[PDB]
Amino acid sequence: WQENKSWNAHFTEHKSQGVVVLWNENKQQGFTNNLKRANQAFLPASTFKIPNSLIALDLGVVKDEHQVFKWDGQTRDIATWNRDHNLITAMKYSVVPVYQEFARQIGEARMSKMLHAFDYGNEDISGNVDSFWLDGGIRISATEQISFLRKLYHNKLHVSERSQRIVKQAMLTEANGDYIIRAKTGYSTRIEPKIGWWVGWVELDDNVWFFAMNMDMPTSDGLGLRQAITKEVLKQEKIIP
Ligand SMILES: CC(=O)Nc1cccc(-c2cc(C(=O)O)cc(-c3ccc4cccnc4c3)c2)c1
Numbered sequence: 001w002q003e004n005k006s007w008n009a010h011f012t013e014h015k016s017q018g019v020v021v022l023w024n025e026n027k028q029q030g031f032t033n034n035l036k037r038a039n040q041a042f043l044p045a046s047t048f049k050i051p052n053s054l055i056a057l058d059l060g061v062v063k064d065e066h067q068v069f070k071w072d073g074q075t076r077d078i079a080t081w082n083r084d085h086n087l088i089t090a091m092k093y094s095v096v097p098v099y100q101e102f103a104r105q106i107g108e109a110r111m112s113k114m115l116h117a118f119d120y121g122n123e124d125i126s127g128n129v130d131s132f133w134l135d136g137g138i139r140i141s142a143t144e145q146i147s148f149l150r151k152l153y154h155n156k157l158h159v160s161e162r163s164q165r166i167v168k169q170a171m172l173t174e175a176n177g178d179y180i181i182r183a184k185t186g187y188s189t190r191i192e193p194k195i196g197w198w199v200g201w202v203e204l205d206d207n208v209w210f211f212a213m214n215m216d217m218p219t220s221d222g223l224g225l226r227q228a229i230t231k232e233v234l235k236q237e238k239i240i241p
Pocket residue numbers: 045046094096134185186187190220223
């Protein structure tokens with residue numbers, strides 16, 4: 001591991017504070033601007049949709065990435081939530097109510113067992129089964145996110161290969177002739193400190209770079225900084241053009 005406080009400039013310039021953690025898979029080396037915060041545990045918020053999707057798929061709660069989850073007809077304040085969704089769009093638009101139904105059908109017992117099998121965070125689902133990742137007891141650090149993401153990438157999690165391929169498909173965020181990004185955003189507001197997440201990885205021709213970042217997010221106005229700051233670090237380290 002190596003600490004590179006020069007990255008702190010990317011947060012300071014936006015009057016923000018946070019951590020970026022990078023892992024070079026070929027060289028098995030990690031890099032971060034803040035070793036302490038890289039190991040501080042936060043609510044996973046919507047980044048939990050990764051493990052939740054894996055479990056729902058492996059148990060048959062979700063048949064496949066085409067199954068339609070019909071809008072329940074309750075108008076919510078995020079327009080894209082008031083519509084039918086499948087796994088792909090539910091991930092893309094971080095559709096909480098779809099994933100809350102997943103968790104209810106999963107149930108406490110199976111959720112707890114699977115999170116321990118995943119070695120996911122503190123593996124603590126204390127709270128309500130349909131909201132614990134937003135205001136319950138579960139916590140995960142940036143370094144712990146990378147550990148989990150690396151297992152998913154290599155199909156080494158204790159679910160089927162199919163379940164892992166589908167979730168990695170649903171994580172697809174950006175792709176061009178230079179790189180592919182599979183990732184999931186998060187926004188934790190119910191428990192202080194309010195933070196934004198972005199965790200995932202960058203696929204190159206002959207390497208993969210895992211990343212996990214969180215940053216202080218007092219207002220939703222700064223949510224775009226999650227990706228922007230992360231990409232500035234990637235550019236600085238010459239991982240992307
Ligand atoms: C119910 C609960 O626990 N909330 C929660 C749970 C899971 C995900 C999110 C969430 C994620 C994102 C994201 O990942 O980008 C963005 C927003 C969000 C929220 C408010 C906004 C206001 C103006 C403009 N844009 C906004 C955007 C919310 C919130």
